[PDB]
Design a binder for this molecule. Structure first.
Ligand SMILES: *[C@@H]1O[C@H](CO)[C@@H](O[C@@H]2O[C@H](CO)[C@@H](O)[C@H](O)[C@H]2NC(C)=O)[C@H](O[C@@H]2O[C@@H](C)[C@@H](O)[C@@H](O)[C@@H]2O)[C@H]1NC(C)=O
Ligand SMILES: *[C@@H]1O[C@H](CO)[C@@H](O[C@@H]2O[C@H](CO)[C@@H](O)[C@H](O)[C@H]2NC(C)=O)[C@H](O[C@@H]2O[C@@H](C)[C@@H](O)[C@@H](O)[C@@H]2O)[C@H]1NC(C)=O
Ligand SMILES: *[C@@H]1O[C@H](CO)[C@@H](O[C@@H]2O[C@H](CO)[C@@H](O)[C@H](O)[C@H]2NC(C)=O)[C@H](O)[C@H]1NC(C)=O
Ligand SMILES: *[C@@H]1O[C@H](CO)[C@@H](O)[C@H](O)[C@H]1NC(C)=O
Ligand SMILES: CO[C@H]1O[C@H](CO)[C@H](O)[C@H](O)[C@H]1O
Ligand SMILES: CO[C@H]1O[C@H](CO)[C@H](O)[C@H](O)[C@H]1O
Length: 257
């Protein structure tokens, strides 16, 4: 009933108890991923998340409150209970606030903030601390492809050698250009028919994505899903659109060698 993993988030860095110190109150931060004990988090049935025998704890339950390690039996019960929604948030149920990395840099301190479904609020509980590299196959068994910064993504015939068909699926729930990992698949707005492009990763809600059980790729803020516009691949436009279950909204990842 307990199991232990790393927690990967913004820019692929991991949740780390600062300096590897275990004294009560030590803040959680981002740090490059590794096997050190202060990056190993044990998820217990009681909804606690523990490292070095102590609990992930809200040091306060307000917008901007720090998250720290603290003795599990002395901390407040409301402050040590967490849930892990399927869209990759880490939420403190009492406050409704979510774990947020406000900057990408190593040593950024993790805070509880209002949920805006930002990529800075996406996390992946996993033992694989490297991004998973895959082609994204969709409508007509075509592949989603990059075409440079500030340019639309679109469908092309899948080719094992096309580097612009290769995507790094990061722990912060961003979908990145594998060969240029500072660039993220981004919706150019939150309205139906807004275009999906590549832009510099900035931790925004427009850059957060979820692969759901219906084969959809969902943008949690807008609720809308990637869609090959009008089921017409020669338009070379992928948009966000309400989920219909239709073939032009169905996707699957295929891991690359
Ligand atoms: C919760 O904390 C967030 C981080 O401090 C607030 O967002 C930040 O607000 C700053 C102004 O106080 C602003 O300069 C920052 O750009 C912004 N950061 C980001 C990335 O959102 C947030 O404030 C709300 O949202 C911002 C964008 C403004 O519209 C504010 O007027 C809002 O109050 C805080 N949320 C709440 C509800 O207090
Ligand atoms: C969390 O705080 C608890 C209460 O202060 C610690 O338990 C206490 O540890 C004292 C010093 O080690 C010990 O003499 C006390 O009898 C005990 N108090 C209670 C109410 O159990 C606890 O330490 C852990 O649990 C105790 C019982 C021993 O097994 C320690 O060696 C454990 O570390 C604190 N937990 C942690 C992880 O620090
Ligand atoms: C995706 O991009 C990554 C990062 O550039 C590539 O990984 C590098 O691969 C080279 C050659 O195998 C190694 O020297 C490095 O160790 C890798 N870097 C990292 C950070 O992992 C990768 O080859 C690309 N393509 C695929 C399919 O993964
Ligand atoms: C698909 O888009 C192309 C290119 O814009 C257009 O010429 C073509 O007629 C479209 N096909 C349909 C069925 O609309
Ligand atoms: C020098 O490494 C130590 O400090 C850094 C930075 O604080 C991290 O906490 C890391 O996990 C810990 O081993
Ligand atoms: C009439 O709907 C068709 O076009 C819209 C865009 O106009 C969406 O792409 C939708 O999924 C597709 O079925």
């Amino acid at each position: 009933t307990s199991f232990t993993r790393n927690i990967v988030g913004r820019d692929g860095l991991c949740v780390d108890v600062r300096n590897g110190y275990d004294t009560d109150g030590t803040p959680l931060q981002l740090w490059p991923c590794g096997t050190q004990r202060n990056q190993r988090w044990t998820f217990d049935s009681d909804d606690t998340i523990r490292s070095m025998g102590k609990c992930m704890t809200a040091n306060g339950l307000n917008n901007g409150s720090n998250i720290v390690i603290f003795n599990c039996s002395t901390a407040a019960e409301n402050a040590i209970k967490w849930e892990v929604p399927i869209d990759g948030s880490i939420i403190n149920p009492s406050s409704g606030l979510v774990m947020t990395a406000p900057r990408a840099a190593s040593r950024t301190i993790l805070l509880l903030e209002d949920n805006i479904y930002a990529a800075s609020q996406g996390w992946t509980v996993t033992n694989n601390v490297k991004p998973i590299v895959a082609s994204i196959v969709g409508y007509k068994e075509m592949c989603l492809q990059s075409n440079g910064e500030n340019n639309g993504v679109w469908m092309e015939d899948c080719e094992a050698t096309s580097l612009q068909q290769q995507w790094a699926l990061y722990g912060d729930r961003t979908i990145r250009v594998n060969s240029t990992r500072g660039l993220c698949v981004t919706t150019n707005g939150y309205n139906s028919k807004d275009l999906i492009i590549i832009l510099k990763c900035q931790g925004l809600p427009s850059q957060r994505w979820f692969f759901n059980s219906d084969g959809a790729i969902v943008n949690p803020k807008s609720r809308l899903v990637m869609d090959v516009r009008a089921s017409n691949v020669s338009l070379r436009e992928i948009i966000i659109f309400p989920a219909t279950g239709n073939p032009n909204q169905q996707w699957v990842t295929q891991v690359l060698p």
